[PDB]
């Protein structure tokens, strides 16, 4: 999970 995490930042 970074991307979708990422779109959280």
């Excluded at 999970?1 to 930042?9: F, H, S």
């Amino acid at each position: 999970d970074i991307r979708l995490a990422k779109t959280l930042v």
